[PDB]
Amino acid sequence: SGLLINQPKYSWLKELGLSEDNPGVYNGSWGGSGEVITSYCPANNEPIARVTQATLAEYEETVQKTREAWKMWADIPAPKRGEIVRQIGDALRKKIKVLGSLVSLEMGKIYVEGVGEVQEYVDVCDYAVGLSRMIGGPVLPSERPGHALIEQWNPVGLVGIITAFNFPVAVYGWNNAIALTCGNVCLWKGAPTTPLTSVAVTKIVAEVLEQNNLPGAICSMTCGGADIGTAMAKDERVDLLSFTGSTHVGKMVAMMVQERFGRKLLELGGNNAIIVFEDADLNLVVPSAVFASVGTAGQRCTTTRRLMLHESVHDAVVERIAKAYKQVRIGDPWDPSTLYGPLHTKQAVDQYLAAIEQAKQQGGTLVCGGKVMDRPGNYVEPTIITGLAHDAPIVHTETFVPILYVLKFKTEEEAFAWNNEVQQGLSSSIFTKDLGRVFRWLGPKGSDCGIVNVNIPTSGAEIGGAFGGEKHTGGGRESGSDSWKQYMRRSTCTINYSKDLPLAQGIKF
Amino acid sequence: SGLLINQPKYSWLKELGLSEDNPGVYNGSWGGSGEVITSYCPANNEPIARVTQATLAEYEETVQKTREAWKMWADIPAPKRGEIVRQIGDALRKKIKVLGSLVSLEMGKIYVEGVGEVQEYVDVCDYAVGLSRMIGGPVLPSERPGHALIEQWNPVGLVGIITAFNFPVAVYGWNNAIALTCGNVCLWKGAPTTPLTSVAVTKIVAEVLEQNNLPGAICSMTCGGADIGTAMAKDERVDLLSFTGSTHVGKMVAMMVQERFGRKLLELGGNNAIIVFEDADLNLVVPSAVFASVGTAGQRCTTTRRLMLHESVHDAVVERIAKAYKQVRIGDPWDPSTLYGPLHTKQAVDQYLAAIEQAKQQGGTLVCGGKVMDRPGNYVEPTIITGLAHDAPIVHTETFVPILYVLKFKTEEEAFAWNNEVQQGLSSSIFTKDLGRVFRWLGPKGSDCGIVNVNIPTSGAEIGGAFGGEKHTGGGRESGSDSWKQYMRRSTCTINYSKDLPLAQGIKF
Amino acid sequence: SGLLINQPKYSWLKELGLSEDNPGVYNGSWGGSGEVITSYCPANNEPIARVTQATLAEYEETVQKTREAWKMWADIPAPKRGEIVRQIGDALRKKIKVLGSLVSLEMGKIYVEGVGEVQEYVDVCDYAVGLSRMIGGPVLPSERPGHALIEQWNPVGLVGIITAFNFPVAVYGWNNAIALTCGNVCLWKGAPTTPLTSVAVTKIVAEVLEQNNLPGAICSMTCGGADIGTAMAKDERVDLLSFTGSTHVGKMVAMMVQERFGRKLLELGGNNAIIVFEDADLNLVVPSAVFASVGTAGQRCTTTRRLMLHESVHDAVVERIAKAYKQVRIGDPWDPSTLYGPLHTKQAVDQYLAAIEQAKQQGGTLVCGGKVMDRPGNYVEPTIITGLAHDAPIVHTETFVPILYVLKFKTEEEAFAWNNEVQQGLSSSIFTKDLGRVFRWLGPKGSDCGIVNVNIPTSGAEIGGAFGGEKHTGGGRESGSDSWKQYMRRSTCTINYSKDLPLAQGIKF
Amino acid sequence: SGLLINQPKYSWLKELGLSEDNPGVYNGSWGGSGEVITSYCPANNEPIARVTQATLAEYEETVQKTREAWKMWADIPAPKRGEIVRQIGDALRKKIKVLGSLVSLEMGKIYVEGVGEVQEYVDVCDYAVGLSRMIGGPVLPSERPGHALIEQWNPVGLVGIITAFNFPVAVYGWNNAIALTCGNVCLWKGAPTTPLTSVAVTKIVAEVLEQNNLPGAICSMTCGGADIGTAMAKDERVDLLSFTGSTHVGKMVAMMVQERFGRKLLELGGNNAIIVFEDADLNLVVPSAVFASVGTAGQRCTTTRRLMLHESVHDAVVERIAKAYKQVRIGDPWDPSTLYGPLHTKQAVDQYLAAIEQAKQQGGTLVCGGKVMDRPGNYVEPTIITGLAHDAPIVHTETFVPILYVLKFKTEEEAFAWNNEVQQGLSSSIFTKDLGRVFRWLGPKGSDCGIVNVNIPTSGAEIGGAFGGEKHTGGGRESGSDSWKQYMRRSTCTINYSKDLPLAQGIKF
């Protein structure tokens, strides 16, 4: 019976500036006349509302308006750009509950995590305000008398941002706050299945830009599929392409960007491992493992996919994790009791079922889960599988679903090697009390991941540090440390200010 | 007339450990059984000596010996690796004259510049010794009580280095010193036309490694053509590929490395512009322009290719540069009088003649030069061409030859735009006395190059700063600032050291 | 005619939580039973309201409560402390107008500048939020195998802050935001003549701390004179004393802190010089000079005291500045476009008159001003004096009053030397178009000040950079760059995590 | 019989350029006509040779020559200054054995440690070479359009260096290498009892300066007592005074420098504690404790003075350390068998005997040692004392002698507090396997020292990190991290390069 938005139960969606049909293009003015997409709530498969995506011609026009906006934007001092970013942070803060609710409704993650995602954007904005007075390179001492030597950083220009479904607000945010602070203009193509969240966020940002008499095209949005995404990847006018998504798609995009010598920031797949040693605090391990695997229905890029247990504690730990799995409250994402919601799409359910099959075929035993739940929505049981070899093809594959593969190990050398043997390289954790092991894990013969944690799971990450992975995860970094450098171009500048002339070396002038 | 090396006039070549035939593979032991190449002296087209290049199977075996060497090398503390780099610096210092002489003989650049190139390696070694006690990331304050947060840097593993002909010692050096300091092992494939220099350098480095009882494979070398170069680009065991060469070849290599998610450092073509404004010190401009254009026979990646003169000074400056060109002493590279030697190959001579032709077809007038010199060796006249449009196809192309294209401009906006309009983005210079112009040139609406100079030519660059370009020049950086980061992998590490347990949130454990 | 606060025209003072009598001590609870001081409005010499200052015993008790608060505060992660600092920023933002108005009423500076001062605190808070995720030292590579080497930064403990009258909000703010972010607790003794501003600020901060269930003693205040100030200087429990004030008082305090090996941050006197060269843009010079000299009635520590004019432009510039001085409209602190108010106290008026007489006795000629204005308040005429020798005793003295001493120079060497010859070393400016001169001025044979400006006056300074002087100005730095390090203690930490034992060297164990 | 230098067994002293009488002043030329001091070998109380110290008038003249040398030296680019530092490093390297031998002969430490000290100078030189291309501040983004903002670092001028007896080469070296790299000139007053080492070093440095046609006054030396030292402390021409010595003398010097607003670097006393917890590796603890206490005859500023043992391991550990003490080979410093030489002076022996007395009076029991050894030289037995209270006056005092006070503790809180309770704050160590304890020790409620070590003793320190202490140790830092900043002055520079004029705000110009 109709779109959710038309029902009174859902009229809070109107506070986000959303309607039955929504324009999917913003570039200072709203529009869009491409394919009309209908966004479904994964909790009950009911349609929420529609978004009209961009045509290539509308993308084309958006890039021109963006390029033009950059001209005036790049001329605004960085601390003054930070003032804009600060206000974006505040505008978001005001709408945190309803925006969090939309994320929960459209993506499927629990309400508190929807709110948490909005907070990530808010917090990275405040961080960026700090950076706006800091970004730059060293003044260096030249070897030449009467010469100044400085390292300059400047905006790359336009930052294209392609994001994944699972974090429809935060990923954009992490990129937006930094890119803006760095004097760039953004163009955003969110995941096709979360266009309402894209529009809602763009609405909040657009209003701030407009309050401040700035061209709206500084933060443009064009919703669409591979369609538009490919155009961005091939577009010479896109100075930096930030891609967050599958490692399969990322590769296609990377190759296209490389082809035209563009800059890229790649945030791709993970196959994240928790390694539990004999001396680990098991009272810490068990809840850590559960929440890291089960959270967001196994749909964070940082979700634990591989749990390696030392032979001495293997059977005891598995059983305890299994006892916890039984108490994982599955239900409506809006319900404060719910810890675990639906998978994002029906295709996701199919991957889940297929991965279950392959696991069995490869010698896996199901400890629990494995079945599609008999109810509205894309609900599947959180699954634990023991018995597979460390290099079973399915274990080496990222399947974006709540399945946890349990591995049994003996030596430290083994576990470390198995952690590293896969093609992904996002996140990693060991649980241990051993001082030497901690630093070995952190050193050159330890983990090969971008995130390397000790006694905290694979999803433990904060704004202050650089976020991203290695190998097939793509190399890119977001948010903390000197991540900003990816959004700017370095120039090594020598200024001769002396009256000294170069040696004539035999020639008369 | 035989090989030069057999003649007494050239027995100093034996001090570099060189013989009639030379092994082109080193990996802890010397060998090679691939194609035998004969290295010619471009000053007289006489054969110097031969080098036996690697077979794929010998490359293959070198990669395994390299990987094995890394194991022990990565375990050596960075300051202690720096001690090795220090000694390489000193070993080079002892052989500076003869090695400089070999560069001059085999590449074709003047003796003093051959010596200067060796000095670059020496100086970057001493710089690396400093870095060996410095490399690393920040300790960061975690938002979580009882949690440490640190940024760790670790060796990427094996660094493949492919170098160009024009700087056969320095480019390898810049990479070697840094990579070694950073706990990596190197594999070097030098330009096919400079294998004797490759071998000579490798010999010097090998001896130091051996004096210190270190596996020689830490600094491996396999000489060869596209053959081996492609193998490296495709090899998953090469953790970072550093490529210095043409932007055409770089692309092929880049695409191959991207395909397999490897790390790349790209140091490609340039189309470097000097912009002379009305208020410029012409007594500084004239000698600067001459030496920057004519030096190394127009064969530095940083060589001035485009000289933009303000209409008010155009005709006066061109004429003065032309008067200087007449006094450029052309001769034997070994001869201390010579300022200008031969082009590196005969093919180079053909590019030169072809570019002359295209320049004429596109409306160019030859101010001077343009003719192959009637004498032994690959000698061509240093050429100046006026009258071409800023966007004449030939002007936008890097031709690695001593031709200088002269452009006439009026507005600052014009000159800046023309500097940026090309696909290359290595080096750039303006000559002016205007305070505001200087900073605009350095800012966001100024030069888009990696090197952005004021009142010093396009080849003004020192160790202390990052070296490299933007756009089609490839993005890579060498030597100074935080260039070292490209040779290492970042990991964001969170250590939970507290006894705190995570909230149970309704679940009983 | 009673207290101003009791009159309806001034009831906005009640919005700041102010009353007829006000407690001058806060340490989690309010009080004070020392001397009752009456704060006068320097615009009309009318009493505003009273503040009860601290007794030594109440200072004593405040230090204990502060030390106790630190225990819990130091345990809170830096980003979480930044969240507190963020809220202080916001709380201030809400009260910006009334607080600015109080500064204007109690100190005497114009309304817009009162508001500007509050903004400084607000902006430094947002800066500190950035720092809260950044502060720390490098992870360093140890020369010892299996050893970690890190630089740790930790709170010094309690930061005592003694501030001057002229910036009663901002100076405290610059210190508060950073110290808090760095895990310190603060104790504030503001200038005796601005206790209402001290209380008002403390009230705003106290409320934020209390909203967040934090001990109020984290930001303690004890109002008083030299009395309390000396106690702080001598108190071993004060880990860092930040002193902003006269260089005469600063010295006494410094000596006392040195005596007990405490840490000190000194922000003392200035004798700031503007040097105008022949090629300067005079249309820029004239307004710059006027506003830098006349602003805040010559009562900024950065105020231009010495204006050095090249002989060629001397008489023309003086006359133009004089024409501008005539249009400097004296009005009332609040008001619309009042550009100039009263001196802070009557004693200030006496210094002004005495400095005038000494100037005359030392050969000075009054171009304008010099007379006490016949009206309510501490109003004096803005004065220009020509003819004095560069080393006339009065010129070398900081008199905190709106007198501008004009010097005539010829050579660059002269001007630079005269700038440096004084004992103060806060701020300095040159106005010129000469590229070489700019960098000479910035280099080792240029200015010896902490602030070294080009084509901007002596009061040009922003949050992003470190603020402070050299020589008799005291060495301290506030706000930007790595100023934070003064508020923390560095520790060089080596962690041995290996099983390696030290060489027995002949001894059996 | 007679001076040692005249005997053939000691003619290697002539290789250092030493003679019977030696000039104690160098400032480009050698001389000195003050008090003639005779330097005695503490191993046999035999006179080595004489040095003629400076008169005040000769100090005075040396300061003028130094100031004059600075003019030309400050004009030399930092990397080119580093080239000088590099050569100093090499000149030292050539003389390492004989210079090490002199340290051993004149100070009394064992030969291998004399050599090690020279190596510290050599290694810090190479470090400084790296820094010579790195030193400087950030380029910062200004909030003002068309304004550049940069942090500049410049030489302070002349660095006065006053050193202690115990490290007569290295302390100077650590200061020399950095100060020179930073464009300062040095004046050195070494300890009165080690003037031959001072002269020998100065000779090596002087030669390098002269080889390079630089004024010798860049590295001046004036030998003398409190006499000259006080003059330096009071001298306004000394821009920075670096003092290494007793905390008693340091205070006098500090107070004098503070009085005249000079810069100071203080490296004073230590009372260094090793804390051994229950879970410590005792096989590591015992040899660590022995060597850290007994090394250099207890005469390093980092020497372990306090050993805190957990009650559970106390009696076992003391006994094991005592068994090791018996095997400590006491003898001639020149003999390769010797691990432990003489105390530096006879007064030192008296302090030792007096501290023994006070320890007994305060309830201490001698485990071993306590007696003057019956032999030539200042030899005393290495002493261990148990039973004293943590706050026994003698334990809180630094006595520069080989006595180790053993404390028994129970709680972690206790040990940490006892470590911090003293007025010194140089070095500290804990021995433990507990992950949480390690980071608590490093954090805000851990050690309050400048050096904070884990599982390595109190003398574990390397070039890469900043070296120095807190509290009564004086705050100064040497060598690593950003220690260099203490040798330079910061300037925050704003450059307005736009044509923009400031708002007229009602005034017509």
mmCIF file of C-alpha atoms in Angstrom, chain A residues 154-342:
data_model
loop_
_atom_site.group_PDB
_atom_site.id
_atom_site.type_symbol
_atom_site.label_atom_id
_atom_site.label_comp_id
_atom_site.label_asym_id
_atom_site.label_seq_id
_atom_site.Cartn_x
_atom_site.Cartn_y
_atom_site.Cartn_z
ATOM 1 C CA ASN A 154 47.315 23.673 -3.299
ATOM 2 C CA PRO A 155 43.841 22.315 -4.150
ATOM 3 C CA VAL A 156 43.778 19.619 -6.817
ATOM 4 C CA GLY A 157 40.547 21.213 -8.087
ATOM 5 C CA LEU A 158 37.431 19.035 -8.340
ATOM 6 C CA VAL A 159 37.103 15.926 -6.150
ATOM 7 C CA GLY A 160 34.733 13.284 -7.508
ATOM 8 C CA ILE A 161 33.378 11.090 -4.722
ATOM 9 C CA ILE A 162 31.809 7.687 -5.338
ATOM 10 C CA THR A 163 30.506 6.007 -2.177
ATOM 11 C CA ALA A 164 29.227 2.596 -1.058
ATOM 12 C CA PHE A 165 25.777 1.703 0.304
ATOM 13 C CA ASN A 166 26.800 0.649 3.808
ATOM 14 C CA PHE A 167 27.940 4.049 5.081
ATOM 15 C CA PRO A 168 25.835 6.490 2.974
ATOM 16 C CA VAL A 169 26.569 9.561 5.137
ATOM 17 C CA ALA A 170 30.008 9.125 6.757
ATOM 18 C CA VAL A 171 32.162 8.172 3.764
ATOM 19 C CA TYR A 172 30.987 11.259 1.869
ATOM 20 C CA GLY A 173 31.511 13.268 5.068
ATOM 21 C CA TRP A 174 35.089 12.127 5.633
ATOM 22 C CA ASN A 175 35.870 13.221 2.070
ATOM 23 C CA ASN A 176 33.748 16.368 2.029
ATOM 24 C CA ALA A 177 35.140 17.970 5.196
ATOM 25 C CA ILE A 178 38.741 17.410 4.147
ATOM 26 C CA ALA A 179 38.370 18.254 0.438
ATOM 27 C CA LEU A 180 36.480 21.477 1.229
ATOM 28 C CA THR A 181 39.057 22.499 3.844
ATOM 29 C CA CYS A 182 41.697 21.933 1.166
ATOM 30 C CA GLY A 183 40.060 24.331 -1.311
ATOM 31 C CA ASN A 184 38.522 21.704 -3.560
ATOM 32 C CA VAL A 185 34.999 21.430 -4.905
ATOM 33 C CA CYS A 186 33.129 18.121 -4.651
ATOM 34 C CA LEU A 187 30.894 16.089 -6.944
ATOM 35 C CA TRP A 188 29.021 13.243 -5.235
ATOM 36 C CA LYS A 189 27.590 10.066 -6.717
ATOM 37 C CA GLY A 190 26.219 7.957 -3.867
ATOM 38 C CA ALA A 191 25.212 4.298 -4.037
ATOM 39 C CA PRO A 192 22.136 3.728 -6.263
ATOM 40 C CA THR A 193 20.286 2.054 -3.391
ATOM 41 C CA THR A 194 20.670 4.995 -0.958
ATOM 42 C CA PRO A 195 19.740 8.078 -3.040
ATOM 43 C CA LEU A 196 17.361 9.505 -0.380
ATOM 44 C CA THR A 197 20.266 9.717 2.087
ATOM 45 C CA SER A 198 22.380 11.331 -0.612
ATOM 46 C CA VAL A 199 19.676 13.946 -1.277
ATOM 47 C CA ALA A 200 19.027 14.553 2.435
ATOM 48 C CA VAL A 201 22.733 15.219 3.110
ATOM 49 C CA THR A 202 23.100 17.361 -0.019
ATOM 50 C CA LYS A 203 20.063 19.378 1.144
ATOM 51 C CA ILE A 204 21.688 20.091 4.529
ATOM 52 C CA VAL A 205 25.010 21.084 2.902
ATOM 53 C CA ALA A 206 23.343 23.133 0.131
ATOM 54 C CA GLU A 207 21.455 25.245 2.675
ATOM 55 C CA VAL A 208 24.692 26.155 4.509
ATOM 56 C CA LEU A 209 26.417 27.131 1.243
ATOM 57 C CA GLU A 210 23.408 29.250 0.281
ATOM 58 C CA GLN A 211 23.165 30.929 3.742
ATOM 59 C CA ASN A 212 26.775 32.001 3.114
ATOM 60 C CA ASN A 213 26.178 33.271 -0.445
ATOM 61 C CA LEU A 214 28.438 30.627 -1.986
ATOM 62 C CA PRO A 215 27.813 28.842 -5.284
ATOM 63 C CA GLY A 216 26.004 25.589 -4.477
ATOM 64 C CA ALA A 217 28.150 23.738 -7.017
ATOM 65 C CA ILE A 218 30.963 23.637 -4.442
ATOM 66 C CA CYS A 219 29.188 20.518 -3.160
ATOM 67 C CA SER A 220 27.440 19.038 -6.199
ATOM 68 C CA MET A 221 25.545 15.758 -6.332
ATOM 69 C CA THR A 222 24.518 13.592 -9.271
ATOM 70 C CA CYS A 223 22.788 10.324 -8.364
ATOM 71 C CA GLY A 224 23.191 7.328 -10.676
ATOM 72 C CA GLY A 225 24.674 3.905 -11.374
ATOM 73 C CA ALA A 226 27.814 2.623 -13.117
ATOM 74 C CA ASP A 227 26.514 4.878 -15.846
ATOM 75 C CA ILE A 228 27.647 8.136 -14.150
ATOM 76 C CA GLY A 229 30.368 6.477 -12.055
ATOM 77 C CA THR A 230 32.286 5.452 -15.189
ATOM 78 C CA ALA A 231 31.935 8.959 -16.664
ATOM 79 C CA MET A 232 33.614 10.357 -13.543
ATOM 80 C CA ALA A 233 36.404 7.753 -13.699
ATOM 81 C CA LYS A 234 37.098 8.715 -17.333
ATOM 82 C CA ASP A 235 36.611 12.488 -16.860
ATOM 83 C CA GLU A 236 39.843 14.515 -17.159
ATOM 84 C CA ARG A 237 38.060 17.369 -15.359
ATOM 85 C CA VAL A 238 37.802 15.193 -12.235
ATOM 86 C CA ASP A 239 41.151 16.007 -10.603
ATOM 87 C CA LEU A 240 40.837 13.375 -7.862
ATOM 88 C CA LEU A 241 38.490 10.428 -7.781
ATOM 89 C CA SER A 242 37.774 9.063 -4.328
ATOM 90 C CA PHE A 243 36.194 5.635 -4.624
ATOM 91 C CA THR A 244 34.683 3.664 -1.764
ATOM 92 C CA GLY A 245 33.247 0.295 -2.821
ATOM 93 C CA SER A 246 33.944 -3.289 -3.865
ATOM 94 C CA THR A 247 37.482 -4.225 -4.834
ATOM 95 C CA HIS A 248 36.117 -5.612 -8.155
ATOM 96 C CA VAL A 249 34.528 -2.296 -9.171
ATOM 97 C CA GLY A 250 37.409 -0.307 -7.668
ATOM 98 C CA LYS A 251 39.828 -1.996 -10.072
ATOM 99 C CA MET A 252 37.786 -0.989 -13.157
ATOM 100 C CA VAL A 253 37.674 2.597 -11.881
ATOM 101 C CA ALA A 254 41.382 2.634 -10.894
ATOM 102 C CA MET A 255 42.434 1.384 -14.356
ATOM 103 C CA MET A 256 40.306 4.083 -16.017
ATOM 104 C CA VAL A 257 41.760 6.837 -13.804
ATOM 105 C CA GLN A 258 45.323 5.561 -14.297
ATOM 106 C CA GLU A 259 44.762 5.564 -18.068
ATOM 107 C CA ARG A 260 44.264 9.356 -18.030
ATOM 108 C CA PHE A 261 46.903 10.095 -15.328
ATOM 109 C CA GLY A 262 44.285 11.298 -12.816
ATOM 110 C CA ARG A 263 44.686 11.117 -9.028
ATOM 111 C CA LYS A 264 42.792 8.350 -7.211
ATOM 112 C CA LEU A 265 41.936 7.465 -3.620
ATOM 113 C CA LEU A 266 40.918 3.823 -3.266
ATOM 114 C CA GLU A 267 38.952 2.456 -0.303
ATOM 115 C CA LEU A 268 38.049 -1.076 -1.302
ATOM 116 C CA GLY A 269 37.317 -4.541 0.141
ATOM 117 C CA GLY A 270 38.412 -6.145 3.407
ATOM 118 C CA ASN A 271 38.865 -9.691 4.725
ATOM 119 C CA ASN A 272 39.505 -8.756 8.301
ATOM 120 C CA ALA A 273 41.023 -11.168 10.801
ATOM 121 C CA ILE A 274 40.936 -11.388 14.597
ATOM 122 C CA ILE A 275 43.716 -13.558 16.007
ATOM 123 C CA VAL A 276 43.186 -14.909 19.533
ATOM 124 C CA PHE A 277 46.273 -16.211 21.332
ATOM 125 C CA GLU A 278 46.522 -18.553 24.328
ATOM 126 C CA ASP A 279 47.140 -15.742 26.834
ATOM 127 C CA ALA A 280 44.248 -13.548 25.613
ATOM 128 C CA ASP A 281 41.615 -12.212 27.997
ATOM 129 C CA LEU A 282 38.694 -14.374 26.870
ATOM 130 C CA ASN A 283 36.164 -12.148 28.694
ATOM 131 C CA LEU A 284 37.309 -9.408 26.330
ATOM 132 C CA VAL A 285 37.622 -11.628 23.245
ATOM 133 C CA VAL A 286 34.075 -13.067 23.250
ATOM 134 C CA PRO A 287 32.079 -9.803 23.314
ATOM 135 C CA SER A 288 34.597 -8.147 20.980
ATOM 136 C CA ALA A 289 34.288 -10.972 18.438
ATOM 137 C CA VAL A 290 30.471 -11.028 18.604
ATOM 138 C CA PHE A 291 29.888 -7.305 18.069
ATOM 139 C CA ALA A 292 32.609 -6.972 15.415
ATOM 140 C CA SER A 293 31.085 -9.842 13.371
ATOM 141 C CA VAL A 294 27.386 -9.241 13.980
ATOM 142 C CA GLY A 295 27.294 -5.419 13.920
ATOM 143 C CA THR A 296 25.615 -3.777 10.901
ATOM 144 C CA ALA A 297 24.607 -7.351 9.924
ATOM 145 C CA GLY A 298 28.192 -8.018 8.848
ATOM 146 C CA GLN A 299 28.147 -5.142 6.397
ATOM 147 C CA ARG A 300 31.015 -2.897 7.524
ATOM 148 C CA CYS A 301 34.151 -2.967 5.410
ATOM 149 C CA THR A 302 35.948 -3.509 8.714
ATOM 150 C CA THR A 303 33.694 -6.419 9.845
ATOM 151 C CA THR A 304 35.519 -9.471 11.203
ATOM 152 C CA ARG A 305 35.420 -12.168 8.527
ATOM 153 C CA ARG A 306 38.131 -14.454 9.867
ATOM 154 C CA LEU A 307 38.481 -15.486 13.501
ATOM 155 C CA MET A 308 41.688 -17.361 14.242
ATOM 156 C CA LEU A 309 41.721 -19.216 17.554
ATOM 157 C CA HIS A 310 44.691 -20.898 19.157
ATOM 158 C CA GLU A 311 44.142 -24.651 19.391
ATOM 159 C CA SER A 312 44.252 -24.488 23.217
ATOM 160 C CA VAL A 313 41.221 -22.167 23.428
ATOM 161 C CA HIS A 314 39.482 -22.903 20.090
ATOM 162 C CA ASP A 315 36.574 -25.125 21.206
ATOM 163 C CA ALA A 316 35.878 -23.144 24.400
ATOM 164 C CA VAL A 317 35.780 -19.791 22.570
ATOM 165 C CA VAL A 318 33.630 -20.972 19.627
ATOM 166 C CA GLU A 319 31.043 -22.353 22.059
ATOM 167 C CA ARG A 320 30.945 -19.126 24.083
ATOM 168 C CA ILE A 321 30.549 -17.048 20.907
ATOM 169 C CA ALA A 322 27.768 -19.417 19.860
ATOM 170 C CA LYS A 323 25.964 -18.907 23.194
ATOM 171 C CA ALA A 324 26.143 -15.151 22.620
ATOM 172 C CA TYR A 325 24.840 -15.457 19.032
ATOM 173 C CA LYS A 326 21.626 -16.973 20.402
ATOM 174 C CA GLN A 327 20.949 -13.768 22.384
ATOM 175 C CA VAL A 328 21.508 -11.418 19.437
ATOM 176 C CA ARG A 329 18.172 -9.621 19.185
ATOM 177 C CA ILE A 330 16.980 -9.584 15.569
ATOM 178 C CA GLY A 331 14.144 -7.161 14.660
ATOM 179 C CA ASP A 332 13.037 -3.768 13.278
ATOM 180 C CA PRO A 333 16.000 -1.341 13.010
ATOM 181 C CA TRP A 334 13.872 1.470 14.538
ATOM 182 C CA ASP A 335 13.303 -0.651 17.694
ATOM 183 C CA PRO A 336 15.784 0.201 20.518
ATOM 184 C CA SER A 337 15.929 -3.501 21.508
ATOM 185 C CA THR A 338 17.246 -4.594 18.097
ATOM 186 C CA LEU A 339 20.978 -5.279 17.786
ATOM 187 C CA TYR A 340 20.796 -6.819 14.316
ATOM 188 C CA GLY A 341 18.804 -5.812 11.225
ATOM 189 C CA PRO A 342 18.364 -6.967 7.612
#
